[PDB]
Amino acid sequence: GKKIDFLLSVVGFAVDLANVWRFPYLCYKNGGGAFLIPYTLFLIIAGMPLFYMELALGQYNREGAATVWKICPFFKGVGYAVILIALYVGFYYNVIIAWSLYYLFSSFTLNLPWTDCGHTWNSPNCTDPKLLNNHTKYSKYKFTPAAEFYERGVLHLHESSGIHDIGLPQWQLLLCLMVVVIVLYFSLWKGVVVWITATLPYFVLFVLLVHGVTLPGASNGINAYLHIDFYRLKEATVWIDAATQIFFSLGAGFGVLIAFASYNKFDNNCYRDALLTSSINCITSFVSGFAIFSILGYMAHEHKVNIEDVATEGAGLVFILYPEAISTLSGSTFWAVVFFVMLLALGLDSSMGGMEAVITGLADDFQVLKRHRKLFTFGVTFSTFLLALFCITKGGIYVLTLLDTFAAGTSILFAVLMEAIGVSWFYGVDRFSNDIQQMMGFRPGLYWRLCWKFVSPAFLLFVVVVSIINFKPLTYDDYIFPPWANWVGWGIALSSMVLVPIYVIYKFLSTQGSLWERLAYGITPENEHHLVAQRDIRQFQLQHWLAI
Ligand SMILES: [Cl-]
Numbered sequence: 310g311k312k313i314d315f316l317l318s319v320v321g322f323a324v325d326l327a328n329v330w331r332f333p334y335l336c337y338k339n340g341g342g343a344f345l346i347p348y349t350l351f352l353i354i355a356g357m358p359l360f361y362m363e364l365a366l367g368q369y370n371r372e373g374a375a376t377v378w379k380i381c382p383f384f385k386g387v388g389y390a391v392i393l394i395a396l397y398v399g400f401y402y403n404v405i406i407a408w409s410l411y412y413l414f415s416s417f418t419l420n421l422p423w424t425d426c427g428h429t430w431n432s433p434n435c436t437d438p439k440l441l442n443n444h445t446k447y448s449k450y451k452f453t454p455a456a457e458f459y460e461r462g463v464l465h466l467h468e469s470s471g472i473h474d475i476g477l478p479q480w481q482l483l484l485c486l487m488v489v490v491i492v493l494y495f496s497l498w499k500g501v502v503v504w505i506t507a508t509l510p511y512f513v514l515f516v517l518l519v520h521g522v523t524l525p526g527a528s529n530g531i532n533a534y535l536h537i538d539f540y541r542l543k544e545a546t547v548w549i550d551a552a553t554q555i556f557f558s559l560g561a562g563f564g565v566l567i568a569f570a571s572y573n574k575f576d577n578n579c580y581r582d583a584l585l586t587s588s589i590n591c592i593t594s595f596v597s598g599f600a601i602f603s604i605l606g607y608m609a610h611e612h613k614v615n616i617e618d619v620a621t622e623g624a625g626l627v628f629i630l631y632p633e634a635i636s637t638l639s640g641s642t643f644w645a646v647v648f649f650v651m652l653l654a655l656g657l658d659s660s661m662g663g664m665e666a667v668i669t670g671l672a673d674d675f676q677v678l679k680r681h682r683k684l685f686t687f688g689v690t691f692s693t694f695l696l697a698l699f700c701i702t703k704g705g706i707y708v709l710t711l712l713d714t715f716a717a718g719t720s721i722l723f724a725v726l727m728e729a730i731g732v733s734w735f736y737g738v739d740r741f742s743n744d745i746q747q748m749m750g751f752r753p754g755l756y757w758r759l760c761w762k763f764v765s766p767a768f769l770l771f772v773v774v775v776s777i778i779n780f781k782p783l784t785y786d787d788y789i790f791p792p793w794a795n796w797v798g799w800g801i802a803l804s805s806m807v808l809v810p811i812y813v814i815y816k817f818l819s820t821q822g823s824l825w826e827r828l829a830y831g832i833t834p835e836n837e838h839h840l841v842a843q844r845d846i847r848q849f850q851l852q853h854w855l856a857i
Pocket of ligand 1: 327328332554558594
């Protein structure tokens with residue numbers, strides 16, 4: 310009875326829109342398996358400890374992303390940075406849900422629009438494998454009925470020459486975005502059915518696996534998935550992608566975990582939560598990759614194209630793959646409806662989590678907003694609506710790619726690294742362990758403390774540095790962005806990165822007293838500031854810095 314509720318809760322917590330939409334094309338962009346090795350390694354080493362850290366911080370301090378830094382006042386800039394990262398992601402995260410709503414609306418028919426050519430949106434080059442009996446060597450084969458539908462009857466991308474000619478918003482995606490935004494606002498306006506939003510993703514995935522294994526070309530897709538290329542592992546692109554996707558799927562670095570845990574019971578078991586979430590995430594990622602590559606092998610067989618060229622490597626890979634596998638099921642209309650309802654539910658839940666992450670973080674800092682949740686929610690929602698309108702234009706896919714590349718890459722990694730440093734070195738891993746013992750009754754093991762203090766920061770710093778010194782100019786399949794687009798993306802990435810040093814400078818300059826007094830007040834918890842006048846600061850001793 311109640312244990313069923315516990316199950317539903319944990320499984321729903323372990324699923325995300327990321328695992329269903331983003332992981333497929335990141336695994337396919339790399340070799341598959343070659344992406345799972347770095348994925349699992351980083352998952353354990355950095356993701357599990359930092360997920361546990363964020364949950365414990367939120368639970369113990371009962372604060373959001375920003376105000377939780379009363380323990381170490383100099384990192385409120387890190388809190389602000391994660392809130393800004395969360396605000397940036399929503400702009401394009403809400404457009405991926407409008408796509409799901411459009412596909413659901415298009416799915417209410419006995420002849421799915423992506424099954425064959427002959428529609429108003431099909432180009433003369435549309436090739437239906439059933440209606441007819443090569444393809445360069447390194448193009449992405451955009452002439453299939455499903456790709457044609459996605460890019461011309463939904464995106465209308467054929468009316469944009471690049472990110473310099475995005476055009477005007479598409480009026481159908483406009484209505485879908487309006488509906489999504491209204492639903493979010495009315496689901497968030499009055500405070501902080503989910504049963505069927507945690508079981509459906511696994512039923513869909515199970516059906517996908519079982520059915521796609523038994524397809525004419527799935528064997529070669531599985532063989533490609535299970536073949537590992539280490540010369541790919543020697544490039545750091547896979548490592549950067551794996552780290553970013555880990556922090557996307559687990560929800561760390563967005564302020565969502567801290568805000569959600571601020572409402573948890575003080576005695577809730579965070580260690581069990583972290584273990585279960587990480588295990589489910591790993592298993593789900595592996596199964597999702599398996600099914601995705603089985604479908605990719607099927608399409609490679611059907612279209613007589615190389616597996617590396619069958620589908621796009623960016624956002625929309627799912628909107629091509631999943632319709633193409635649904636069209637081969639019996640009663641495909643029912644399956645399309647079910648699948649796109651599943652996508653809508655998952656996306657709405659993820660957007661609600663992120664928007665709540667932002668609203669709670671900003672309301673804890675300013676009480677006026679906390680007293681006017683309706684108006685503040687409306688403001689956040691309307692800003693998101695406009696900055697997402699930017700992404701539903703004819704060239705909106707280019708803007709979405711730029712955002713999905715730059716709004717949480719080196720920025721989210723840097724923010725999580727700063728969180729770990731502030732919690733482990735300046736606040737004290739020993740103090741954090743004592744707090745965890747006070748909450749849950751047992752102290753964290755040596756592995757957790759080592760990961761929090763040395764291992765996870767080291768790997769995070771390595772990946773952050775490598776993502777900067779080894780930066781590949783942005784591209785969308787065969788399209789190469791103009792040089793200024795990369796500068797715009799890097800400015801977007803820095804807009805949140807610079808909030809940490811800027812706030813450190815501001816806090817230092819605001820505090821009164823001599824240099825040492827200002828430093829002590831900036832590194833001491835606000836509830837122990839009376840000790841500063843007594844010249845009793847742990848951080849000014851070697852024992853604090855040599856503590857694990
Ligand atoms: Cl994932």
